[PDB]
Amino acid sequence: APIPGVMPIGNYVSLYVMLPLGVVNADNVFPDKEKVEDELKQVKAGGCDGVMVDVWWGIIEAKGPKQYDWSAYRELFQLVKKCGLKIQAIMSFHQCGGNVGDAVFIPIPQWILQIGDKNPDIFYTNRAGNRNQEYLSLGVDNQRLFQGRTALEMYRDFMESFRDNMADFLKAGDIVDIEVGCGAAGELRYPSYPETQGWVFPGIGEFQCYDKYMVADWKEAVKQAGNADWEMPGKGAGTYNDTPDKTEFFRPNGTYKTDMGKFFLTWYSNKLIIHGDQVLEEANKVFVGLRVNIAAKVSGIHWWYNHVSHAAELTAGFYNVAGRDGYRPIARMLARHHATLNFTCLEMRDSEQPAEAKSAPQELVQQVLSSGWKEYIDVAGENALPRYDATAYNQMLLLVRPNGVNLNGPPKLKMSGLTYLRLSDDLLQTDNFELFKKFVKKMHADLDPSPISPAVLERSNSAITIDELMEATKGSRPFPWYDVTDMPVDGSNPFD
């Protein structure tokens, strides 16, 4: 039996905090150095392991192709290191802000956007012909349109430059995680619920495959299946703020369940998996042999999860329905690259969502974490929305150790890390910050903050075919979850 009071260190879950947006600004300057230094000191003194920051493509490569300026990011990283903190860096090949609310606006490089004025099909496009300018469509990953480069080559060259220009932070163990941005907002998904085209929760979203590149690919695919005339979804799919039962495509027994529907949903979800595969392959080639994790971010699309159609999942590109696990194939792709899955919604409870949304964040998290663990990858995560209350912190503590602490060794089920959204004035307010420090102590299994490295990143494994990957869609039971955390922020123990 274990010795009373001894907590095995394998129970510890690292806790990182996301830096404010614009910490390095759109002119590639790091302003308010003193304020930031101060915040970093408070975060460290609260026990946090590190911080996460976006490394914005539209800052670094702004002046032109392969003109990279890493100066301000080096100053920031040096400061974080000096405050005793680890760094998670996001390779952010997407747009920051741009709405009236948003305090910062950083588009992708203007020399890319200029290409888009004359070729709007470089962007994800909805069936009405709206272009999302926040990210380059997967349809252009391998199109040599960008002053002699393809999109994948641009991503590769940027990551190589980052590695070479941060070589000393990488050697010293200061940079611990590279999150590779794979879509708008950095997430591996289609931009199916854009605020800029009027989406409001809990709309079903819209398919984002109408650019001419993805269309040429589709037309070829359906011809080979023996159905030349199958079209992409039309008016039957409805629009962003429909509910599934108001559509033909997503109603019970609707189009999604027809042979044409299944064929379309397979193709659509496979193009997203292939895009992830190609982007992470480039990351693995850059970072192989270094002690750093490489991660992809999958957003938690929890609305309509309890509807037969899983319509919001489907429009986002995750073909997850009864009898078809749409996340496990992503995890298996990730495993090939020795990459980590970063998921969201770790704080959410089903009872917090309106009933009409058919929303099940708890069961979604359980499915996705279970499917990643079954593929022998690490899974990390984030809170989806800002939360400062004990209920939220206790839900995240449940998710990071879904069968609580293990006094005999490392837990059976443990997330590899949590990144908290986000450092702000509200978080540092005296009351909230007090609660937050208890959350961090519980993340650490009541151990003291404890600095060593990620594993050495192995080279990507040999390729498997699309069809071998589809074996991973077989449905399975998720691991059983506890109903409450072991280590609530009030210090009690619900098992005594």
Coordinates of C-alpha atoms in Angstrom, one line a residue:
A1 CA 0.0 0.0 0.0
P2 CA 1.2 3.6 -0.5
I3 CA 2.6 5.7 2.4
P4 CA 0.1 8.3 3.6
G5 CA 1.0 11.8 2.3
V6 CA 3.2 10.8 -0.6
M7 CA 1.9 12.0 -3.9
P8 CA 3.6 10.4 -6.9
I9 CA 5.0 13.1 -9.3
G10 CA 3.4 11.4 -12.3
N11 CA 0.1 13.0 -11.0
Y12 CA 1.4 16.5 -11.9
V13 CA -0.3 18.3 -14.8
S14 CA 1.5 21.3 -16.2
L15 CA -0.4 24.6 -16.2
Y16 CA 0.3 27.3 -18.9
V17 CA -1.4 30.7 -19.3
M18 CA -2.1 32.3 -22.6
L19 CA -0.5 35.8 -23.0
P20 CA -2.7 38.7 -24.0
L21 CA -3.2 39.1 -27.8
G22 CA -0.8 41.7 -29.3
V23 CA 1.9 41.2 -26.7
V24 CA 4.0 41.7 -29.8
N25 CA 2.0 44.2 -31.9
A26 CA 1.3 44.5 -35.6
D27 CA 4.4 46.7 -36.2
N28 CA 6.6 43.9 -34.7
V29 CA 7.3 45.9 -31.6
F30 CA 7.0 44.5 -28.0
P31 CA 5.4 47.5 -26.0
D32 CA 4.7 47.9 -22.3
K33 CA 7.7 45.7 -21.4
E34 CA 7.4 46.6 -17.7
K35 CA 3.7 45.8 -17.4
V36 CA 4.3 42.4 -19.2
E37 CA 7.3 41.7 -17.0
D38 CA 5.1 42.3 -14.0
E39 CA 2.4 40.0 -15.2
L40 CA 4.9 37.3 -15.9
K41 CA 6.2 37.6 -12.4
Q42 CA 2.7 37.3 -10.9
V43 CA 1.9 34.2 -13.1
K44 CA 5.2 32.6 -12.0
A45 CA 4.6 33.4 -8.3
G46 CA 1.2 31.8 -8.6
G47 CA 2.9 28.6 -9.5
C48 CA 2.3 28.4 -13.3
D49 CA 4.7 26.3 -15.4
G50 CA 4.7 28.6 -18.5
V51 CA 2.9 30.7 -21.1
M52 CA 1.5 30.3 -24.6
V53 CA 1.8 32.9 -27.3
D54 CA 0.8 33.3 -30.9
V55 CA 3.8 33.8 -33.3
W56 CA 1.9 35.7 -36.0
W57 CA 2.7 35.0 -39.6
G58 CA 1.5 38.6 -40.6
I59 CA 4.0 40.1 -38.1
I60 CA 7.1 38.0 -38.9
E61 CA 7.0 37.7 -42.7
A62 CA 5.2 41.0 -43.3
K63 CA 7.6 42.8 -45.6
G64 CA 7.8 40.1 -48.2
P65 CA 8.6 36.5 -49.0
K66 CA 11.3 35.1 -46.7
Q67 CA 11.9 38.4 -45.1
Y68 CA 11.5 37.2 -41.5
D69 CA 12.0 39.5 -38.5
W70 CA 12.2 37.6 -35.2
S71 CA 13.5 40.5 -33.1
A72 CA 10.6 41.4 -31.0
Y73 CA 9.7 37.7 -30.4
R74 CA 13.3 37.0 -29.2
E75 CA 13.0 39.9 -26.6
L76 CA 9.7 38.5 -25.4
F77 CA 11.0 35.0 -25.1
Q78 CA 14.1 36.2 -23.3
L79 CA 11.9 38.0 -20.8
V80 CA 9.6 34.9 -20.2
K81 CA 12.7 32.8 -19.6
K82 CA 14.1 35.4 -17.2
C83 CA 10.9 35.2 -15.2
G84 CA 11.4 31.4 -14.8
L85 CA 8.7 30.3 -17.3
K86 CA 8.4 27.9 -20.2
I87 CA 7.1 28.8 -23.6
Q88 CA 4.5 27.2 -25.9
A89 CA 4.7 28.9 -29.3
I90 CA 1.9 28.8 -31.9
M91 CA 2.9 29.0 -35.5
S92 CA -0.1 31.2 -36.3
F93 CA -0.6 31.1 -40.1
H94 CA -3.9 33.0 -39.6
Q95 CA -5.5 36.3 -38.8
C96 CA -5.8 37.9 -35.4
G97 CA -8.8 40.1 -34.6
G98 CA -10.3 42.5 -37.2
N99 CA -13.7 43.1 -35.7
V100 CA -14.9 46.3 -34.0
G101 CA -14.5 44.8 -30.6
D102 CA -11.0 43.5 -31.1
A103 CA -8.1 45.4 -29.6
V104 CA -5.7 44.0 -32.2
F105 CA -5.8 43.3 -36.0
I106 CA -3.0 41.2 -37.6
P107 CA -4.0 39.8 -41.1
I108 CA -1.9 37.3 -42.9
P109 CA 0.9 39.0 -44.9
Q110 CA -0.3 41.7 -47.3
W111 CA 1.7 40.2 -50.2
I112 CA -0.5 37.0 -49.8
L113 CA -3.7 39.0 -49.5
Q114 CA -2.8 40.8 -52.8
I115 CA -2.8 37.5 -54.5
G116 CA -6.3 37.0 -53.1
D117 CA -7.7 40.1 -54.8
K118 CA -7.1 38.6 -58.2
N119 CA -7.6 34.9 -57.0
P120 CA -10.3 34.8 -54.3
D121 CA -10.3 31.0 -54.5
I122 CA -7.2 30.9 -52.3
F123 CA -9.7 31.2 -49.4
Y124 CA -12.3 28.9 -47.9
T125 CA -15.6 29.7 -49.6
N126 CA -19.2 29.0 -48.7
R127 CA -21.9 28.1 -51.2
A128 CA -23.0 31.8 -51.5
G129 CA -19.5 32.7 -52.6
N130 CA -18.3 34.4 -49.4
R131 CA -14.5 34.3 -48.9
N132 CA -12.9 33.9 -45.5
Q133 CA -9.5 35.8 -45.6
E134 CA -8.3 34.6 -42.3
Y135 CA -6.4 31.5 -43.6
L136 CA -5.4 29.9 -46.9
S137 CA -7.7 27.1 -48.0
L138 CA -6.4 23.6 -48.0
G139 CA -7.1 23.6 -51.6
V140 CA -4.0 25.7 -52.2
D141 CA -1.6 23.6 -50.0
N142 CA 0.1 22.3 -53.1
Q143 CA -0.7 25.1 -55.6
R144 CA 2.4 27.1 -56.5
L145 CA 0.7 30.5 -56.5
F146 CA 2.6 32.5 -53.9
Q147 CA 5.5 34.1 -55.7
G148 CA 6.9 30.7 -56.7
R149 CA 6.0 28.9 -53.5
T150 CA 3.0 26.6 -52.4
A151 CA 1.3 27.2 -49.1
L152 CA 2.9 24.1 -47.5
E153 CA 6.4 25.4 -48.5
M154 CA 5.6 28.7 -46.9
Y155 CA 4.6 27.0 -43.7
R156 CA 7.8 24.9 -43.8
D157 CA 10.1 27.8 -44.5
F158 CA 8.6 29.8 -41.7
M159 CA 9.0 27.0 -39.2
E160 CA 12.6 26.4 -40.4
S161 CA 13.4 30.0 -39.9
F162 CA 11.7 30.0 -36.4
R163 CA 13.8 26.9 -35.4
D164 CA 17.1 28.4 -36.7
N165 CA 16.4 31.8 -35.1
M166 CA 15.3 30.3 -31.8
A167 CA 17.9 27.6 -31.7
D168 CA 19.2 28.7 -28.2
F169 CA 15.8 28.8 -26.5
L170 CA 15.1 25.3 -28.2
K171 CA 18.5 23.9 -26.8
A172 CA 18.0 25.3 -23.4
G173 CA 14.5 23.7 -22.9
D174 CA 12.8 27.1 -22.8
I175 CA 10.5 26.4 -25.7
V176 CA 8.6 23.2 -24.8
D177 CA 5.7 23.0 -27.4
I178 CA 5.2 24.1 -31.0
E179 CA 1.4 24.3 -31.8
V180 CA 1.1 24.2 -35.6
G181 CA -1.7 26.3 -36.8
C182 CA -3.9 24.4 -39.3
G183 CA -6.8 26.7 -40.0
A184 CA -8.6 29.9 -39.0
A185 CA -7.9 30.6 -35.3
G186 CA -5.1 28.1 -35.6
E187 CA -7.5 25.1 -35.5
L188 CA -7.6 22.0 -37.6
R189 CA -11.1 22.5 -39.0
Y190 CA -13.0 24.3 -41.7
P191 CA -14.2 27.9 -40.8
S192 CA -17.8 26.7 -40.6
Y193 CA -19.2 29.1 -38.0
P194 CA -17.6 32.5 -38.9
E195 CA -18.8 35.5 -36.8
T196 CA -18.0 37.7 -39.8
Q197 CA -20.7 36.0 -41.9
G198 CA -23.3 36.2 -39.2
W199 CA -23.1 32.9 -37.3
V200 CA -24.5 32.9 -33.8
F201 CA -24.5 30.0 -31.3
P202 CA -25.9 27.4 -31.8
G203 CA -26.2 27.6 -35.6
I204 CA -25.4 24.4 -37.6
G205 CA -22.7 26.2 -39.6
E206 CA -22.0 25.8 -43.3
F207 CA -19.8 23.7 -45.4
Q208 CA -16.6 25.5 -46.6
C209 CA -15.6 23.6 -49.7
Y210 CA -16.8 25.8 -52.6
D211 CA -13.4 27.3 -53.7
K212 CA -12.5 26.3 -57.3
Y213 CA -9.6 24.1 -56.1
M214 CA -11.6 21.9 -53.7
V215 CA -14.4 21.9 -56.3
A216 CA -12.1 20.5 -59.1
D217 CA -11.0 17.8 -56.6
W218 CA -14.6 17.0 -55.7
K219 CA -15.6 16.6 -59.3
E220 CA -12.9 14.2 -59.9
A221 CA -13.6 12.2 -56.7
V222 CA -17.4 11.7 -57.5
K223 CA -16.6 10.6 -61.1
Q224 CA -14.4 7.9 -59.8
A225 CA -17.1 6.7 -57.3
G226 CA -19.3 6.2 -60.4
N227 CA -21.6 9.3 -59.9
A228 CA -20.3 12.1 -62.1
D229 CA -23.4 14.3 -61.4
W230 CA -23.3 14.2 -57.5
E231 CA -23.1 17.8 -56.4
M232 CA -21.9 19.4 -53.3
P233 CA -24.7 20.2 -50.8
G234 CA -27.1 22.9 -52.0
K235 CA -30.0 24.7 -50.4
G236 CA -30.9 21.5 -48.6
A237 CA -28.0 22.1 -46.2
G238 CA -29.6 25.3 -44.9
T239 CA -27.5 28.3 -43.7
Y240 CA -25.3 29.2 -40.7
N241 CA -28.1 29.7 -38.2
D242 CA -30.5 26.9 -39.1
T243 CA -31.2 24.0 -36.8
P244 CA -30.8 20.5 -38.2
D245 CA -34.6 19.7 -38.3
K246 CA -35.2 22.8 -40.5
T247 CA -33.0 21.4 -43.3
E248 CA -33.1 18.5 -45.7
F249 CA -29.4 17.5 -45.2
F250 CA -29.4 17.3 -41.4
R251 CA -32.9 16.2 -40.5
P252 CA -33.4 12.7 -39.1
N253 CA -33.1 10.4 -42.1
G254 CA -31.9 13.3 -44.2
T255 CA -29.4 13.6 -46.9
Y256 CA -26.4 13.0 -44.5
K257 CA -27.5 9.4 -44.3
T258 CA -27.8 8.8 -48.1
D259 CA -25.0 7.3 -50.1
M260 CA -24.4 10.7 -51.7
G261 CA -24.3 12.3 -48.3
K262 CA -21.9 9.8 -46.8
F263 CA -19.7 10.1 -49.8
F264 CA -19.6 13.9 -49.5
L265 CA -19.0 13.8 -45.7
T266 CA -16.2 11.3 -46.2
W267 CA -14.5 13.3 -48.9
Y268 CA -14.9 16.5 -46.9
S269 CA -13.5 15.1 -43.6
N270 CA -10.7 13.3 -45.4
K271 CA -9.5 16.5 -47.1
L272 CA -9.2 18.1 -43.6
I273 CA -7.3 15.0 -42.2
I274 CA -4.9 15.1 -45.3
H275 CA -4.3 18.8 -44.8
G276 CA -3.4 18.2 -41.1
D277 CA -1.2 15.3 -42.2
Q278 CA 0.8 17.5 -44.7
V279 CA 1.2 20.4 -42.3
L280 CA 2.3 18.3 -39.4
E281 CA 4.7 16.3 -41.7
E282 CA 6.4 19.6 -42.4
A283 CA 6.6 20.4 -38.7
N284 CA 8.0 17.0 -37.9
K285 CA 10.7 17.4 -40.6
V286 CA 11.7 20.8 -39.0
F287 CA 11.7 19.9 -35.3
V288 CA 12.7 16.2 -35.4
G289 CA 15.4 15.4 -32.9
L290 CA 14.6 18.3 -30.6
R291 CA 13.0 18.0 -27.1
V292 CA 9.8 19.8 -28.1
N293 CA 6.2 18.6 -28.5
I294 CA 4.4 19.4 -31.7
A295 CA 0.6 19.8 -31.4
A296 CA -2.5 20.4 -33.5
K297 CA -5.5 22.2 -32.0
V298 CA -9.0 20.6 -32.6
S299 CA -11.9 22.8 -31.5
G300 CA -14.7 21.4 -29.3
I301 CA -17.9 21.6 -31.4
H302 CA -20.4 20.5 -28.7
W303 CA -23.6 21.9 -30.2
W304 CA -25.9 19.3 -31.9
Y305 CA -23.7 16.5 -30.5
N306 CA -26.9 15.0 -29.1
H307 CA -28.8 15.3 -32.4
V308 CA -28.5 12.3 -34.8
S309 CA -26.8 14.5 -37.4
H310 CA -24.0 16.0 -35.3
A311 CA -24.6 18.8 -37.8
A312 CA -22.1 21.4 -36.4
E313 CA -19.4 18.8 -36.2
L314 CA -20.1 17.8 -39.8
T315 CA -19.9 21.3 -41.2
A316 CA -16.5 21.8 -39.3
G317 CA -15.2 18.7 -41.0
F318 CA -15.4 16.1 -38.2
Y319 CA -17.5 13.2 -39.6
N320 CA -18.6 12.0 -36.2
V321 CA -22.1 10.3 -36.1
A322 CA -23.5 7.1 -34.6
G323 CA -21.3 4.2 -35.6
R324 CA -18.5 6.5 -36.9
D325 CA -15.8 8.0 -34.7
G326 CA -14.7 11.1 -36.5
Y327 CA -11.9 12.0 -34.0
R328 CA -10.0 8.8 -33.8
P329 CA -8.8 9.0 -37.4
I330 CA -7.4 12.5 -36.5
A331 CA -5.6 11.1 -33.5
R332 CA -4.2 8.3 -35.6
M333 CA -2.9 10.8 -38.1
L334 CA -1.3 12.7 -35.3
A335 CA 0.4 9.6 -33.9
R336 CA 2.2 9.1 -37.1
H337 CA 3.9 12.5 -36.5
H338 CA 4.4 11.9 -32.7
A339 CA 2.2 14.9 -32.2
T340 CA -0.1 15.9 -29.4
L341 CA -3.8 16.7 -29.7
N342 CA -4.8 20.1 -28.1
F343 CA -8.6 20.1 -27.4
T344 CA -10.9 22.7 -25.9
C345 CA -14.1 22.9 -23.7
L346 CA -12.4 21.3 -20.7
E347 CA -14.4 23.6 -18.4
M348 CA -17.8 23.2 -19.8
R349 CA -20.8 21.4 -18.3
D350 CA -23.8 20.2 -20.2
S351 CA -26.2 21.9 -17.8
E352 CA -24.7 25.3 -18.7
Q353 CA -25.9 25.1 -22.3
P354 CA -29.4 25.7 -23.4
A355 CA -31.5 22.5 -24.0
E356 CA -32.4 23.5 -27.6
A357 CA -28.7 23.4 -28.6
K358 CA -28.6 19.6 -28.0
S359 CA -25.2 20.3 -26.6
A360 CA -22.9 17.8 -24.9
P361 CA -19.4 19.2 -24.1
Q362 CA -18.8 16.6 -21.4
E363 CA -19.5 13.6 -23.6
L364 CA -17.6 15.2 -26.5
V365 CA -14.5 15.7 -24.4
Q366 CA -14.7 12.2 -23.1
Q367 CA -14.9 10.8 -26.7
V368 CA -12.0 12.9 -28.0
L369 CA -9.7 12.4 -25.0
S370 CA -10.5 8.6 -25.0
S371 CA -9.9 8.3 -28.8
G372 CA -6.5 10.1 -28.5
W373 CA -5.3 8.0 -25.6
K374 CA -6.3 4.8 -27.5
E375 CA -4.0 6.0 -30.3
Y376 CA -1.0 6.4 -28.0
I377 CA -0.8 10.2 -28.2
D378 CA -0.7 12.7 -25.5
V379 CA -3.8 15.0 -25.2
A380 CA -3.6 18.5 -23.8
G381 CA -6.3 21.1 -23.7
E382 CA -7.7 24.6 -22.9
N383 CA -10.9 26.2 -21.5
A384 CA -13.1 27.3 -24.4
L385 CA -14.4 30.5 -22.6
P386 CA -13.0 32.8 -19.9
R387 CA -14.1 31.5 -16.5
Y388 CA -13.0 32.5 -13.0
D389 CA -15.3 30.4 -10.9
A390 CA -14.8 27.2 -8.9
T391 CA -17.3 25.2 -10.9
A392 CA -15.2 25.8 -14.1
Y393 CA -11.9 25.0 -12.3
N394 CA -13.3 21.8 -10.9
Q395 CA -14.6 20.7 -14.3
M396 CA -11.1 21.2 -15.8
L397 CA -9.5 19.3 -12.9
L398 CA -11.9 16.5 -13.6
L399 CA -11.0 16.4 -17.2
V400 CA -7.2 16.5 -16.7
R401 CA -7.4 13.4 -14.4
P402 CA -10.7 11.7 -15.2
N403 CA -10.1 8.9 -12.7
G404 CA -8.5 11.2 -10.1
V405 CA -5.0 10.9 -8.5
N406 CA -3.1 7.6 -8.3
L407 CA -1.2 7.1 -5.1
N408 CA 0.7 4.0 -6.5
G409 CA 2.2 5.8 -9.5
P410 CA 1.2 7.9 -12.6
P411 CA -2.6 8.0 -13.3
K412 CA -4.2 5.7 -15.9
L413 CA -5.8 8.7 -17.5
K414 CA -4.0 12.1 -17.5
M415 CA -3.9 15.0 -19.8
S416 CA -0.3 16.2 -20.7
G417 CA -1.1 19.8 -19.9
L418 CA -3.7 22.6 -19.7
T419 CA -3.4 26.1 -21.2
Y420 CA -5.7 28.6 -19.5
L421 CA -7.4 31.3 -21.7
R422 CA -6.2 33.9 -20.8
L423 CA -4.0 36.4 -18.9
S424 CA -6.0 39.5 -18.4
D425 CA -6.9 42.2 -15.9
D426 CA -9.9 40.2 -14.7
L427 CA -7.6 37.2 -13.9
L428 CA -5.1 39.2 -11.9
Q429 CA -7.9 40.9 -9.8
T430 CA -7.2 39.9 -6.3
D431 CA -10.2 37.5 -5.6
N432 CA -10.0 35.7 -9.0
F433 CA -6.3 35.3 -8.8
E434 CA -6.6 33.7 -5.3
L435 CA -9.0 31.1 -6.6
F436 CA -6.7 30.6 -9.7
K437 CA -3.7 29.8 -7.5
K438 CA -5.7 27.1 -5.8
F439 CA -6.6 25.7 -9.2
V440 CA -2.9 25.6 -10.1
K441 CA -2.0 23.9 -6.8
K442 CA -4.7 21.2 -7.6
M443 CA -3.4 20.9 -11.3
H444 CA -0.1 20.0 -9.6
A445 CA -1.8 17.4 -7.4
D446 CA -0.8 19.6 -4.4
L447 CA 2.9 19.3 -5.2
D448 CA 5.1 22.4 -5.4
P449 CA 5.7 23.9 -8.9
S450 CA 8.2 21.5 -10.4
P451 CA 10.6 22.2 -13.4
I452 CA 12.3 18.6 -17.1
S453 CA 12.0 18.3 -20.9
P454 CA 9.5 16.7 -23.4
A455 CA 10.8 13.5 -25.1
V456 CA 13.0 13.9 -28.1
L457 CA 10.8 14.3 -31.1
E458 CA 10.9 11.1 -33.2
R459 CA 10.8 11.1 -37.0
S460 CA 7.3 10.6 -38.5
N461 CA 6.4 7.0 -39.1
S462 CA 5.7 5.5 -42.6
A463 CA 2.7 6.6 -44.5
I464 CA -0.6 4.7 -44.4
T465 CA -3.3 4.9 -47.0
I466 CA -6.6 6.8 -46.6
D467 CA -8.3 3.5 -46.3
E468 CA -6.1 2.1 -43.6
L469 CA -6.9 5.3 -41.7
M470 CA -10.6 4.7 -42.1
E471 CA -10.3 1.6 -39.9
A472 CA -10.0 4.1 -37.1
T473 CA -13.6 5.2 -37.6
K474 CA -15.0 2.0 -35.9
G475 CA -17.0 3.2 -32.8
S476 CA -15.9 2.1 -29.4
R477 CA -16.8 2.7 -25.7
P478 CA -15.0 5.7 -24.2
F479 CA -13.1 5.2 -20.9
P480 CA -15.2 5.6 -17.8
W481 CA -15.1 9.0 -16.3
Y482 CA -15.5 10.0 -12.6
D483 CA -18.5 12.4 -11.9
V484 CA -16.5 14.7 -9.8
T485 CA -12.8 15.6 -9.3
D486 CA -10.7 14.0 -6.7
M487 CA -9.1 17.3 -5.9
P488 CA -11.6 20.2 -5.9
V489 CA -10.5 23.7 -5.3
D490 CA -12.2 23.9 -1.9
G491 CA -9.7 21.3 -0.6
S492 CA -12.3 18.6 0.3
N493 CA -12.2 14.9 -0.8
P494 CA -15.4 13.5 -2.1
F495 CA -14.2 9.9 -1.4
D496 CA -13.0 10.6 2.3

